[PDB]
């Protein structure tokens, strides 16, 4: 039934990666959450999924649509993504033993402009800061440096985690 | 997923021991405390149900002396280069393990002393390593460990079952359905079973056999149980052998059915039930002593094997001959098999004067190698000369003349071999019962009788 | 005294069941409810603790068809002539008999109906004779049965033992203690035992054997077990040959264990699990089948022999045979023995072309008898021809000709019954094991599988 119902019929018994051009809002997580709803019920293993988000409000949005649920599932935004999956229980591993596995991040106060200045901050006074350029991500890109040097950290992420939605 | 290890440093009645694991375990013993013990610890350290009452002061070696509990449990994570199995089993835990390479996974216990409020308080922590371990997160009253492992407890997510006693109020077909059960199919990958009948362990393969011993101090001795292929085709027999003798204390290996008739014999006159403490006559015949003395040496349990001196002949080949009765008990010694021998004698009469041709010439090969023969009589090996009924003539010769009006006794009952001992040992007097007893050639009912020196 | 027989007119499970008796007294079956109502009808009549509590509603076949329960037990109150006995064990009663030339006692218990006021109304009635039965004498709460019977229950003054499922947490060796302590310690003059395990039955003599079937409606069969002083000797192989076989429901008796080799590797090969659904393989040796024949058949247990027509030669003489193979089958249908056969053979050569003359001494003797080869026939009796060897040589020979390089097969298996027939059965397929269950001379294989035929 015209350009409604065949777009819902033929993303909900999809089983493969998704690119959805959504229109200027209105309703684009009433499709995240019903395909999150199908997904969840079809699949009946330990395998969980991943909701990312940029707000903290959608992110309880969507929990407040989908309800509660034991099985693992993350729902919140990318920056709680990234700091509580890859960095904070594999920090100690990939970047030596010395490193903190304790810290609190500000974005507030640090605006430094190098990537091995950056580890000092972390391994010297406790703290996880960001990079000086807007166009540029420390948080995210420390999480692809340790997936790639660690191999403990790769043993998690796929062995959890069945699909990443992203928004 | 594999289960190495367990080493309870303390409970109510355990003080150092360490059992080696597998997938599939079978425990058994005299000490029904100890088994009941050990799946108790099982219970405390990997369900709920048991873990939150926390510990009483009962439940210590001594009630007051070295208050710390600690059950420590070796689960070996990792699994082969082919197979992805290795990442989902990973998967659960995120910071308990340090080095990208870890093959060993670590689960323990830790409980507080019962000086101060009266309670246990339960501590449990994972690790890949025994230092620095890490403590189990927990954010309610569940913790991170409770949606890895779900125990289900028999008695009349990863499965672990825990079965106790399932031979009561069933029926022993229903026990050889059950042990099919267990041992074949792949939904009972993980259990551990306690037994006291050896209807359920019919079947067994890929397993591993605790046994608890007699003392008071209970020590653990764990075998790992397999049967090769070539030993396949006729598994049932070593099987239905094995699972009887598991649970004796002192057993003898011999050859047929007219050896049971002695030997039995024998033990109902002179001994007062053997079987009460401990002695066992296992049939073995026409496979090799090789398995069921690893088996038992393994297992804790001493055994006494009495052996012939046989010749085979080869199969499609004439006058040449095998030493089966020597090659058995030195590939037992771990040697190799010596060298096949041939004579070279006419036709004759196959009857009479090829026996005594044959019973000369193993004469001969006894006096040649009698070092090692010395060397089996350091162990618990005892060989006979030429067969068992020579040494039977030399030890009860005139009442064997006397029953058989025959002028050599000897023929007549390597004649028919069963029929002629039945009765032989029905016309036995006591007496003569205590002159085999006393001779040194049956030094096997001595060592099977197991009368404690001090 | 001697318990003769109980019949239960009606009870929970029981329609017109009729059980022989005697003192020590063992019970087991499939049913365990018709094996624990049965002592529950025992506490009923003999014990007060389940009498004061009266008949519930449950307790009747149908809860509202024919409420009439009467459970009747039979005394045998006369002893010896040369033992005063008698007059001790009648005086405890006086009114009972009317003559004191009475043999045999009853003891019945009668119930009222539950349709009006909701209650059993136990009454006891003794009595010498079914007719004019009389109450039994209570003066109080405690009657006159009272103080002569004391029922001793034992679960995990006449005395009478009630023990349920002893084997419950117990070694194996405490079982065979505790056989010993009912079967030969005078203390333990009558109870009544419940088991499924037999290693309470290692030894037994002077007891009752009741089998429970494993239908719904409970049918009961009653045996008297004895075991004659000509088998003495050998009592405790018998003992634990049967021990095992009385749990069956299909049963076959061989020689020999090269023939448990066979038919196991058979029977593993085209049955899933004979042991599943009744079979069992039973190792006679040495000895005749007329003590399995009638305790299997007493029992209502099926019985499948299969034998071999074999020669014996006479002790003390030469040339004289009996036809032992055959006399054991024609003794097993009650016919008398035969005379033994002599014949007149030159001293030739005495290995091989004998057992030629024996062979076909032996297939002429088996077209002789052919009349009572087809009586055997008629029922599950198997004889052979010659050899079971010369039967596999008939079914499956072309394959032990690609086995053994010998031109002929048959001879190399009797040169080693027990290490070449391994050898055979490793070195097997699966098309000739169909080959083998499919010939007619071993329709045992048919017999002991037990297809339903409708």
Redesign the interface.
């Given at each position: 039934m015209i350009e409604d119902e065949m777009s819902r019929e033929q993303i909900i018994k999809d089983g493969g990666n998704i690119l959805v051009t959504a229109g200027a809002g209105s309703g684009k997580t009433t499709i995240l959450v019903s395909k999150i709803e199908a997904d969840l019920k079809e699949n009946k293993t330990?395998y969980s999924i991943a909701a990312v988000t940029f707000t903290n409000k959608a992110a309880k949005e969507i929990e407040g649509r989908l309800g509660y649920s034991?099985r693992?599932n993350f729902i919140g935004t990318n920056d709680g993504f990234v700091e509580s999956?890859i960095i904070?229980?594999?920090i100690?591993?990939a970047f030596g033993?010395d490193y903190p596995?304790n810290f609190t991040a500000e974005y507030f106060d640090n605006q430094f402009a190098s990537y091995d200045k950056g580890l000092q901050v972390l391994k010297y006074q406790n703290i996880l800061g960001t990079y000086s350029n807007p166009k540029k991500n420390f948080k995210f890109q420390l999480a692809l440096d340790i997936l790639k040097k660690?191999?403990?950290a790769r043993?998690?992420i796929?062995?959890?985690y069945f699909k990443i939605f992203i928004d | 997923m594999k289960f190495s290890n367990i080493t309870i440093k303390n409970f109510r009645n355990f003080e150092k021991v360490n059992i080696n694991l597998d997938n599939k375990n079978v425990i058994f013993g005299?000490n029904?405390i100890g088994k009941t013990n050990f799946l108790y610890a099982l219970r405390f350290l990997l369900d709920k149900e048991i873990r939150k009452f926390g510990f009483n002061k009962s439940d210590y070696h001594k009630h007051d002396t070295s208050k710390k509990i600690e059950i420590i449990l070796t689960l070996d994570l990792s699994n082969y280069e082919k197979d992805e199995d290795?990442?989902?089993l990973?998967?659960?835990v995120?910071?308990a393990?340090?080095?990208?390479?870890?093959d060993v996974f670590y689960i323990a216990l830790e409980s507080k002393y019962d000086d101060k409020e009266l309670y246990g308080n339960i501590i449990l922590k994972w690790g890949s390593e025994l230092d620095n371990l890490i403590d189990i997160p927990g954010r309610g009253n569940i913790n991170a460990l409770d949606?890895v492992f779900k125990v289900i407890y028999i008695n009349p997510?990863i499965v672990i079952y825990l079965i106790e006693?399932p031979?009561?109020?069933?029926?022993?077909?229903m026990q050889?359905?059950l042990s099919?059960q267990l041992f074949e199919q792949s939904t009972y990958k993980y259990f551990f079973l306690s037994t006291?009948?050896?209807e359920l362990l019919?079947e067994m393969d890929n397993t591993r056999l605790i046994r608890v011993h007699s003392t008071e101090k209970v020590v653990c001795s764990s075998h790992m149980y397999n049967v090769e292929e070539?030993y396949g085709?006729?598994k049932?027999?070593l099987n239905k052998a094995l699972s009887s003798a598991l649970?004796?204390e002192r057993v003898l290996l011999i050859?047929?059915?007219?050896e049971?008739?002695l030997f039995?014999?024998v033990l109902?006159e002179v001994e007062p039930?053997y079987?009460?403490?401990?002695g066992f006559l296992l049939?073995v015949?026409?496979?090799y002593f090789n398995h069921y003395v690893c088996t038992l040496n393994d297992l804790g349990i001493t055994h006494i094997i009495k052996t012939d001196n046989d010749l085979?002949?080869k199969?499609?080949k004439k006058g040449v001959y095998e030493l089966?009765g020597l090659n058995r008990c030195l590939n037992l010694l771990g040697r190799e098999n010596l060298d096949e021998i041939t004579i070279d004698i006419p036709?004759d009469?196959?009857?009479?004067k090829?026996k005594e041709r044959l019973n000369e010439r193993k004469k001969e090969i006894f006096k040649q190698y009698k070092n090692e023969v010395g060397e089996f009589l350091g162990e618990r090996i005892y060989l006979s000369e030429i067969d068992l009924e020579n040494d039977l003539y030399s030890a009860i010769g005139e009442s064997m003349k006397r029953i058989?009006?025959?002028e050599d006794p000897v023929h007549?009952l390597q004649?028919?071999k069963?029929?002629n001992?039945?009765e032989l040992?029905?016309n036995?007097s006591t007496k003569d019962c205590f002159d085999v007893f006393e001779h040194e050639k049956f030094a096997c009912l001595k060592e099977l009788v197991g009368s404690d020196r001090g």
């Open positions: 330990h034991s693992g999956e904070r229980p594999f100690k591993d033993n596995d660690s191999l403990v043993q998690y796929f062995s959890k | 005299m029904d290795t990442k989902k990973i998967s659960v995120k910071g393990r340090t080095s990208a390479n870890a949606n997510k006693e031979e009561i109020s069933l029926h022993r077909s050889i359905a099919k006291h009948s050896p019919y070539a085709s006729v049932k027999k649970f004796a050859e047929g059915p007219s049971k008739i039995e014999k109902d039930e079987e009460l403490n401990g049939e015949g026409g496979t085979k002949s199969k499609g089966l036709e009469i196959k009857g009479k090829k058989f009006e025959n007549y004649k028919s069963l029929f001992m039945v040992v029905n036995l």
